Design a binder for this molecule. Structure first.
Ligand SMILES: [Ca+2]
Ligand SMILES: [Ca+2]
Ligand SMILES: [Ca+2]
Ligand SMILES: [Ca+2]
Ligand SMILES: [Ca+2]
Ligand SMILES: [Ca+2]
Ligand SMILES: [Ca+2]
Ligand SMILES: [Ca+2]
Ligand SMILES: [Ca+2]
Ligand SMILES: [Ca+2]
Ligand SMILES: [Ca+2]
Ligand SMILES: [Ca+2]
Ligand SMILES: [Ca+2]
Ligand SMILES: [Ca+2]
Ligand SMILES: [Ca+2]
Ligand SMILES: [Ca+2]
Ligand SMILES: [Ca+2]
Ligand SMILES: [Ca+2]
Ligand SMILES: [Cl-]
Ligand SMILES: [Cl-]
Ligand SMILES: [K+]
Ligand SMILES: [K+]
Ligand SMILES: [K+]
Lengths: 82, 100, 63, 55, 103, 83, 54, 63
DNA sequence: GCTTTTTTTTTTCACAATCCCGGTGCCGAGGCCGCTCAATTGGTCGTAGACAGCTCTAGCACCGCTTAAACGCACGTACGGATTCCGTACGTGCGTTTAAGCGGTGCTAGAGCTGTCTACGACCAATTGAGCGGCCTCGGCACCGGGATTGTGAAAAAAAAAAGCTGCA
DNA sequence: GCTTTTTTTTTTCACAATCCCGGTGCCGAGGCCGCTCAATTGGTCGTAGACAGCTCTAGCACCGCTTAAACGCACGTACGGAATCCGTACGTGCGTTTAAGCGGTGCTAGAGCTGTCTACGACCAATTGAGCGGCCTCGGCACCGGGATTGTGAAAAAAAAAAGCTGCA
């Protein structure tokens, strides 16, 4: 079961996120659409993170690899060694 | 004859107020962690992750989706709906310059 | 800590560019000040300029 | 890609429009210059389907 | 009606023609002098007795028209998203809000 | 030394032309005034930064490069006037 | 501002949420950090009018 | 000319960071390459890396 | 107008969510202590840039003519938006199932630090050719006028799908 | 099937707008020239970082309990969206008015370059105290239970606007 861990992003988790963004009523077609978007997000961020890892010659991805990736993507993050 | 039932939308609003009030992560940690490691596979094999790298990624993802939902919502309301649909998300991401 | 580093990098980066554009080898308190006007919103910039000006003046008097 | 856009418009010399058509019609160049404005470039011919005459 | 003989084009036909015309061309669509006065006028609010390179005014106009032409693209989508063909101030306002130009 | 509300020189036809290039087919009357406000804000923001670069360089003349540096700052990079 | 948000929650110590409340409720700080994510901050309570019961 | 100067600044700047993040005083061909991978889209990066590698190889052999 | 019904209205009751008491226990904020370093001090030396002085680029103002564009109104169509209405996609709540989260243990990859040594890059002085500005030319390309071509819109003429009618199986 | 109609076709004609050509003329792309300054050559000197070698951090795997969260299913309400319908806001086209655009001239603020000279910042060695890691402590804060209270909405019961109907004249 699950070569697609993307399904482990449950309908409920997606509803919760949507709640915190003030969404009240949610089309059935959203949960699969959201997974589509979340993947592209992580694809782009992890790609750059892993490039920072390879360049440092490491086999371990660090919080700083992610922080540097997110900043490059215009999604600056505070609290993980900025 | 039947004790209490809430009308569609009432619990929704109840959840909105609860989650807008809290800061804890709203995706379960292990499922998220596997997805991260699964996606990492495609770029380089036998990769290790600091736990704080995975926690950084989840914070950034959750923040991104909450924010996209805020924009998706407004698009729904703009077309005089209360129900967010894919085309709402699509329009938000089009105007945000994330998508062709 | 993130916040300080973030704004450090922004001001220092703009300052770097100010000097570069004007063919200057030196970042002075004047490049920092311009950087700040460009980077901070209205009120914040006024107070920030005010505090920076006050700190330099005090320092130069106390040298 | 600009040279080709000039050739299509029966012109010898590349102008900003040829660069714009070149860049905006290429998925990848378009992404690389997604936040760049090309002076005197204009926009790609694009009329949303809903706006055309129905029949 | 009938042989009025202007051959009055239906509402939206000339509109479409103008769209094809202006999407074909790259020439600036605001009149140069009016725009140059407006630039000088807005610049007075920041500093008095300012001079402008002619290329500095042309760079501001290229920048402006590109920004408005692009905001109209996004505005048009917001109008269509609400099953209208007519752009309205709330369209522009939604575009600018989603763009993060406005709170 | 004239001001005299030159924003009205941004005519209805000129705004209609810009909307046409943007693919817009039908326009509410309310747009024209709403656009003029938007255009003003845009120029205020770009020109405020251009002029900052001017004052820092100790000049009395705004250069293309002041604008090009101003636009780049405002995430609106412009090609074909230097830099 | 964060120390004020902390006292209003009857808390001695600032946590990321007090920093988030401080920043997002200040028009200028919000602008300065308009493209920054504060880890463990959540969002300002806000519900669109059309969604409310009346 | 604007295009060349743009991508010069982007690549160089990313390289500046890569060397800074890894406590390196020196920008090498490895920093440029990693910058290119981060900055250019899929197919463009591949060609670019290919043409960059070729040119270094051919330069080093030509001394 | 009558009876009959749906729609909206209020009234009355149920149920979370919060706030005020009571308390406990865990773990990380906080602060102290050696003591690693980087900040300070006082010195020299070199050059960045402040300033004055001069050149001359290009930015500003002005005028008057032509004509393209802006303006304002007349007119009507197609658009926006309100109202109505129907089907079911979603929200709610329940019982059942699943695996996340926790706290612990056991193993070791690989992060990360030190010490050594030399390949490589900064710096310099001398050399010189690539690329600069300045200048001249001549062919692309902007603009024009004329004719060919393409698309639009109105009415009329045909083709089709729809409506009320009517008998026989 | 039959007429007998509306709805959708198609066809035919006038007309405006756009497209495509060759002709013409202007000016900037293009290339040549001569001088210059930045790239190259060959030289020294120092240290950045490649590498080996060792430490021990923290990342991974695994295990076994306890739920909280996920799952799926029934059920129905309120929402999305189709259809209808009406008023006028907006597009089109025309005549009238305006001022941009053009090409040209005249004047000089000030952009930008040069030469001079010294105040200021880089660099360095000696000194030493701020701030680092490590370590211990003790109170904040997460969590808990027991009530009272006030938000947040859901029925239920009546009131009202709406919709049926009908027999009259
Ligand atoms: Ca403030
Ligand atoms: Ca207590
Ligand atoms: Ca604990
Ligand atoms: Ca304490
Ligand atoms: Ca000691
Ligand atoms: Ca020591
Ligand atoms: Ca000193
Ligand atoms: Ca003329
Ligand atoms: Ca190793
Ligand atoms: Ca070392
Ligand atoms: Ca030559
Ligand atoms: Ca040349
Ligand atoms: Ca030629
Ligand atoms: Ca050498
Ligand atoms: Ca001067
Ligand atoms: Ca101390
Ligand atoms: Ca400490
Ligand atoms: Ca409780
Ligand atoms: Cl959709
Ligand atoms: Cl509006
Ligand atoms: K000048
Ligand atoms: K480790
Ligand atoms: K000086």
């Amino acid at each position: 079961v699950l070569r697609d861990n993307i399904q482990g992003i449950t309908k409920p988790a997606i509803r919760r996120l949507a709640r915190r963004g003030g969404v009240k009523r949610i089309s059935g077609l959203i949960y699969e659409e959201t997974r589509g978007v979340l993947k592209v997000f992580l694809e782009n961020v992890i790609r750059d993170a892993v490039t920072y890892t390879e360049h440092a010659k490491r086999k371990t991805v660090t919080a700083m690899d992610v922080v540097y990736a997110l900043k490059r993507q215009g999604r600056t993050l505070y609290g993980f060694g900025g | 004859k039947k004790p209490h039932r809430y009308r569609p939308g009432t619990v929704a609003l109840r959840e909105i107020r609860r989650y807008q009030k809290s800061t804890e992560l709203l995706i379960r940690k292990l499922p998220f962690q596997r997805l991260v490691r699964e996606i990492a596979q495609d770029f380089k094999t036998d990769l290790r992750f600091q736990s704080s790298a995975v926690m950084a990624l989840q914070e950034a993802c959750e923040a991104y989706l909450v924010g996209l939902f805020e924009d998706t919502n407004l698009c729904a309301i703009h077309a005089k709906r209360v129900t967010i649909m894919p085309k709402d998300i699509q329009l938000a991401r089009r105007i945000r310059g994330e998508r062709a | 800590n993130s916040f300080v580093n973030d704004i450090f990098e922004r001001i220092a980066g703009e300052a770097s560019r100010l000097a570069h554009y004007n063919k200057r080898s030196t970042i002075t308190s004047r490049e920092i000040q311009t950087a700040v006007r460009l980077l901070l919103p209205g009120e914040l910039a006024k107070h920030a300029v005010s505090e920076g000006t006050k700190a330099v003046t005090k320092y130069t008097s106390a040298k | 890609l600009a040279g080709n856009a000039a050739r299509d418009n029966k012109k010898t010399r590349i102008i900003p429009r040829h660069l714009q058509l070149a860049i905006r019609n290429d998925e990848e160049l378009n992404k690389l210059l997604g936040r760049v404005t090309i002076a005197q470039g204009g926009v790609l011919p694009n009329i949303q389907a809903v706006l055309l005459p129905k029949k």
